[PDB]
C-alpha cells in the first residue's frame, strides 16, 4: 500500500496545496480514495463531409445517422480471489506458456531511438498535453530525457514518483509520455518482436490482418472436434485479478540485468499498484488507487490480454477433457497430469484457438467444453449475455462465427479460386467512415481520411456492391495524388498511393499462402461479389429506389465534391465497374 503509491500521492498533493481536501461524499466503494483538488475542463465525434456527400441514401438510415450523435459502475466493482486449485492451474499454465512463447524469441529493452521514431510517425501511445505542446516536441528536448532518467533511476531503486494514470464498456488510461516510454522500454518487445504472431504463439493473430483472419478460422474448422465456441467476457479489463497480474509478471523470469529490474518495476509499481486521476462533476479531480484490473498502455494491454486469455482457454479445455476434477484443490498427481497434458498436447490445443486480446474462438476436442464452467467462472472471466451455469452455445459453421467484430464468407471467383473475405453489417461500415475525431481538419485532410476508408473498402469489402461503388466514387472525388491519412493508425495495406488493383493482387493472390495458383487478376470485373441475397442480408441497399438513383446519378455526386475541393487533378474510377463501362 502507501509505501509504494504515497510518493506519487504526496507529489500531487503539493502541486494543489491550496485545494487539497478529503471530500466525505466520495462515490468510490472498491477504489481506495485519497483526496480531491480543483480543475475545470472536459471531444465529440465530427462528420466527414466528403464521405457523407457520397453516401446520400444512408442520410435517412437511423443505424448510420445515430452513430455520429452524442460503464464506470463496472470499473467500481471487485473480483473475488480464485480458489487454491484454480491458482495452481493458472501458475502451472502461465509458467509453461511463457517458456513456449520464449523458445524462439529473446526479451530485450526497446530504445529511446525506437520510441522517438514511433512518436514522429503518429501512433496512439495514449499520452497527455504541461511543458511541451505535443509528444513530437518533448522527444527532441533533452530536458524531458533527464525527467525520464530521474524516474528510471527511481525504478531501479524500486520506487515511483510520476507514473500516474488519467481516466477518460471502455476506459482509456493516459499517462505522461515519460511513464509511457518506461513502459515501452521494459515491455514493448512483446509487440515490437511479435510474441503473439500465429507462428510464435499458435493461438495468436498479432500482425495477421483482416484478410487472413477468415482463412485462420477455416484452418481451425478443419480440426476434428466439437462446435466452435466464441464466448465474450463481460468487461474483461475489470476481471483481471491480482493473481492474473502475478502470472503475467513471470515474463521477467526470462529477462536479465537492467531489463529484468526495469520490467519488474513496471509490473510492481504501475500494474500491481495504480494511482489514477478522475474528473468528477460534483468539477474536482479525485486521486484513487487499486491493486487489480487492467490499466496499462493499450499495446501492452493487448499482449497481456492475449496471454491471459490463451491461459484461461487452455484451462477451460483441460476442464472439459477431465484433466482435473475440482478447482477447490489440485492433488499432487493432478499437478503432474496437468504438466504432462501441456507437454504432450499443449501446442496442439493452442492451434485449436484464435485469440485477439479478450476475443477468442476455440474448437475443443468435443462439446464437454460447453458445460466446463467452474475454472472459467472462478478465474472471474464471466461470460456476457448468458446465465453463469448455462452451457455455452457453439457454432456449427466457421462462416457464422463472430471474431474481431466480423464474420467471414467463402467466395468463389469465376476462375474457381477461393477467397475467404471479412464482412460485417454494412450500416456499421458506412456509419464509421462518416465520422472523424478531433478539431482543425482542413478540407484536404477530411478528403484524405475519406480516401483511406475508400481504399480499405476496395481491399477488404470489395465483395459488397454498395461499398465497391462508394469506394470508386470517393477515389474519383479526391485528387488522384493526395495521400490517404488517419489520426489513430491489423496490417494497413490500403494506406498507399499505389494503384488499388496492384495492391489487391499482392494481398489476395501473390502473398496469400492459401492461394496455390498465382495468376494475376487483370481487372476489377474478375473480382466477385457475395450473392445478391447474401449482400442484402449483410445490409446492402441493392433493390431500393434510393440506391438505384444514387448509383445512376453518381457522377453528379462526384462532381459536387470535386467543385468543393476545386481545380485539382482527378481520375474517373467508375468505368472499372461493368455498368459504368459504356
Ligand X SMILES: CC(C)(CO)NC(=O)c1cccc(Cl)c1
Handedness of CA 102, 108, 114, 118 (dihedral sign): positive
Alpha-carbon distance values, 576 to 56, 470, 570 (Å): 22, 13, 15
Query: Of 234 and 542, which CB lies nearer to ligand X in the complex structure?
Result: 542
Residue 113 among known ligand-binding residues: no
Query: Between 516 and 555, how does the x/- string for binding to Zn ion read (CB under 5 A)?
Result: ----------------------x-----------------
Q: Which is nearer to Zn ion, 151 or 427 (CB)?
A: 151
Question: Residue 556 annotated as binding?
Answer: no
Extended beta strands in 281-352, E state: 284-290
Residue 465 interacts with ligand X (CB under 6 A): yes or no: yes
The verdict on whether residue 58 carries a ligand-binding annotation is: no
Q: Is 578 in the site for ligand X (CB under 6 A)?
A: yes
Residues in the chain: 582
Contacts of 422 (CB under 8 A, 6+ apart): 210, 211, 213, 214, 406, 408, 460, 461
Q: Find the binding residues for Zn ion in span 422-481 (CB under 5 A).
A: 423
Pick one of Zn ion, ligand X, none as the site partner of residue 423 (Cβ within 5 to 8 A by kind): Zn ion
CB of 209 to Zn ion, least distance (A): 18
> How many residues make contact with ligand X (CB under 6 A)?
8
532 binds, among ligand X, Zn ion, none (CB under 5 to 8 A by kind): ligand X
Positive or negative, the Cα torsion across 401, 403, 407, 412? negative
CB of residue 532 vs ligand X: minimum separation in angstroms?
A: 5
**Shortest distance, position 577 Cβ to ligand X, whole Å:** 5
d(CA 227, CA 393): 9
Is 492 among the annotated ligand-binding positions?
A: no
Q: 423: annotated binding-site residue?
A: yes
Position 579 contacts ligand X (CB under 6 A): yes
The CA R_g of the chain, rounded to the nearest whole Å, is: 26
The residue (of 58 and 307) whose beta carbon lies closer to ligand X is 58
Rounded to a whole number of angstroms, the minimum distance from the CB of residue 480 to ligand X is 23
Q: List the Cα angle 278/281/286 in 5-degree steps.
A: 30
∠ CA 541-547-550, rounded to 5°: 150
Nearer of residues 20 and 580 to ligand X, judged by Cβ: 580
Which of 384, 532, 533, 581 touches ligand X by CB under 6 A? 532
Closest by alpha carbon to 211, among 400, 532, 461? Answer: 461
User: Residue 131, interface with ligand X (CB under 6 A)?
Assistant: no
Is 577 a residue that touches ligand X (CB under 6 A)? yes
Interface stretch with ligand X, choices 123-131, 219-227, 245-253, 571-579 (CB under 6 A): 571-579
Q: What's the rounded Cα separation, in Å, for the pair 188 and 114? A: 10
- Cβ burial of 402 (10 Å; 0-12, 13-18, 19+) is middle
Asked if residue 316 belongs to a known ligand binding site, the reply is no
* Contact flag: residue 148 with Zn ion (CB under 5 A): no
The answer to whether the beta carbons of residues 220 and 228 sit under 8 Å apart is yes
Residues in 261-320 at the binding interface with ligand X, rule: CB under 6 A = none
Ranked by CB distance to ligand X, the top (closest) residue is 542
Does the annotation place 170 within a ligand binding site?
A: yes
The strand ranges marked E within 245-358 are 274-280, 284-290, 353-356
What residue has cell string 473475405? Answer: 421
* DSSP three-state, residue 409: strand
The grid cell for 65 is: 445517422
Which partner in ligand X, Zn ion, none is near 163 (CB below 5 to 8 A by kind)?
Zn ion
* Cα separation values, 108 from 192, 259, 471, 531, Å: 10, 7, 42, 50
Question: Is 195 annotated as belonging to a binding site?
Answer: no
Q: Does 262 bind Zn ion (CB under 5 A)?
A: no
Q: Which residues are annotated as a binding site?
A: 151, 155, 160, 163, 170, 232-233, 235-237, 305, 358-359, 384, 407, 409, 423, 538
Q: Which residues are annotated as a binding site for Mg(2+)?
A: 232-233, 358-359
Instruction: Give the interface with Zn ion as residue ranges (CB under 5 A).
Output: 151, 160, 163, 423, 538
Instruction: Give the interface with ligand X as residue ranges (CB under 6 A).
Output: 465, 529, 532, 542-543, 577-579
Q: Which residues are annotated as a binding site for CTP?
A: 170, 235-237, 305, 384
Amino acid at each position: 500500500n502507501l509505501d509504494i503509491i504515497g510518493k506519487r500521492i504526496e507529489k500531487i498533493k503539493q502541486e494543489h496545496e491550496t485545494s487539497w481536501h478529503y471530500d466525505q461524499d466520495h462515490p468510490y466503494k472498491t477504489w481506495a480514495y485519497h483526496g480531491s483538488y480543483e480543475t475545470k475542463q472536459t471531444a465529440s465525434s465530427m462528420v466527414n463531409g466528403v464521405v457523407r456527400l457520397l453516401t446520400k441514401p444512408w442520410d435517412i438510415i437511423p443505424m448510420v445517422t445515430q452513430m455520429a450523435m452524442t460503464f464506470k459502475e463496472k470499473v467500481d466493482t471487485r473480483t473475488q480471489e480464485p480458489k487454491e486449485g484454480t491458482k495452481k492451474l493458472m501458475k502451472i499454465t502461465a509458467e509453461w506458456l511463457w517458456k513456449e512463447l520464449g523458445k524462439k524469441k529473446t526479451p530485450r529493452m526497446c530504445t529511446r531511438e525506437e520510441f522517438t521514431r514511433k512518436v514522429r510517425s503518429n501512433a496512439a501511445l495514449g499520452a497527455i498535453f504541461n511543458k511541451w505542446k505535443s509528444a513530437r516536441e518533448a522527444v527532441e528536448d533533452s530536458g524531458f530525457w533527464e525527467l525520464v532518467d530521474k524516474e528510471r533511476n527511481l525504478h531501479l531503486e524500486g520506487k515511483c514518483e510520476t507514473c500516474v494514470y488519467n481516466m477518460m464498456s471502455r476506459a482509456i488510461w493516459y499517462m505522461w509520455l515519460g511513464a509511457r516510454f518506461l513502459e515501452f522500454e521494459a515491455l514493448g518487445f512483446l509487440n515490437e518482436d511479435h510474441w503473439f504472431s500465429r507462428e510464435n504463439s499458435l493461438s495468436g493473430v498479432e500482425g495477421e490482418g483482416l484478410h487472413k483472419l477468415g482463412y485462420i478460422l477455416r484452418d481451425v474448422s478443419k480440426k476434428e472436434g466439437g462446435a466452435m465456441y466464441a464466448d465474450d467476457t463481460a468487461g474483461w479489463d475489470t476481471r483481471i485479478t491480482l493473481e492474473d497480474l502475478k502470472n503475467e509478471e513471470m515474463v521477467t523470469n526470462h529477462m536479465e540485468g537492467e531489463h529484468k529490474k526495469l520490467a519488474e518495476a513496471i509490473f510492481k509499481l504501475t500494474y500491481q499498484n495504480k494511482v489514477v486521476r478522475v474528473q468528477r462533476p460534483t468539477t474536482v479531480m479525485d486521486i484513487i488507487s487499486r491493486r487489480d484490473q487492467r490499466g496499462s498502455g493499450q499495446v501492452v494491454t493487448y499482449g497481456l490480454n492475449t496471454f491471459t486469455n490463451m491461459e484461461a482457454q487452455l484451462i477451460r479445455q483441460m476442464e472439459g477433457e477431465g484433466v482435473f476434477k475440482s478447482i477447490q484443490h489440485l492433488t499432487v498427481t493432478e499437478e503432474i497430469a496437468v504438466k504432462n497434458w501441456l507437454v504432450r498436447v499443449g501446442r496442439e490445443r493452442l492451434s485449436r484457438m484464435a485469440i485477439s486480446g479478450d476475443d477468442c474462438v476455440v474448437k475443443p476436442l468435443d462439446d464437454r467444453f460447453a458445460s466446463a464452467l467452474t475454472a472459467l467462472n472462478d478465474m472471474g472471466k464471466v461470460r456476457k449475455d448468458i446465465q453463469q451455469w448455462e452451457p455455452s452455445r457453439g457454432w456449427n459453421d466457421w462462416t457464422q462465427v463472430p471474431f474481431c467484430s466480423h464474420h467471414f464468407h467463402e467466395l468463389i471467383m469465376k476462375d474457381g479460386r477461393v477467397l475467404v473475405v471479412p464482412c460485417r453489417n454494412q450500416d456499421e461500415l458506412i456509419g464509421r467512415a462518416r465520422i472523424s475525431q478531433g478539431a482543425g481538419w482542413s478540407l484536404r485532410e477530411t478528403a484524405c481520411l475519406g480516401k483511406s476508408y475508400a481504399q480499405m473498402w476496395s481491399l477488404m469489402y470489395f465483395h459488397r456492391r454498395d461499398l465497391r461503388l462508394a469506394a470508386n466514387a470517393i477515389c474519383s472525388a479526391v485528387p488522384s495524388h493526395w495521400v490517404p491519412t488517419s489520426r489513430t493508425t491489423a496490417t494497413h495495406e490500403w494506406m498507399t498511393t499505389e494503384d488499388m488493383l496492384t495492391v489487391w493482387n499482392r494481398v489476395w493472390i501473390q502473398e496469400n499462402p492459401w492461394m496455390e495458383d498465382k495468376t494475376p487478376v487483370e481487372s476489377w470485373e474478375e473480382i466477385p461479389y457475395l450473392g445478391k441475397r447474401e449482400d442484402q442480408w449483410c445490409g446492402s441497399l441493392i433493390g431500393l429506389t434510393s440506391r438505384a438513383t444514387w448509383a445512376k446519378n453518381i457522377q453528379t455526386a462526384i462532381n459536387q465534391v470535386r467543385s468543393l475541393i476545386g481545380n485539382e487533378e482527378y481520375t474517373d474510377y467508375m468505368p472499372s465497374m461493368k455498368r459504368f463501362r459504356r
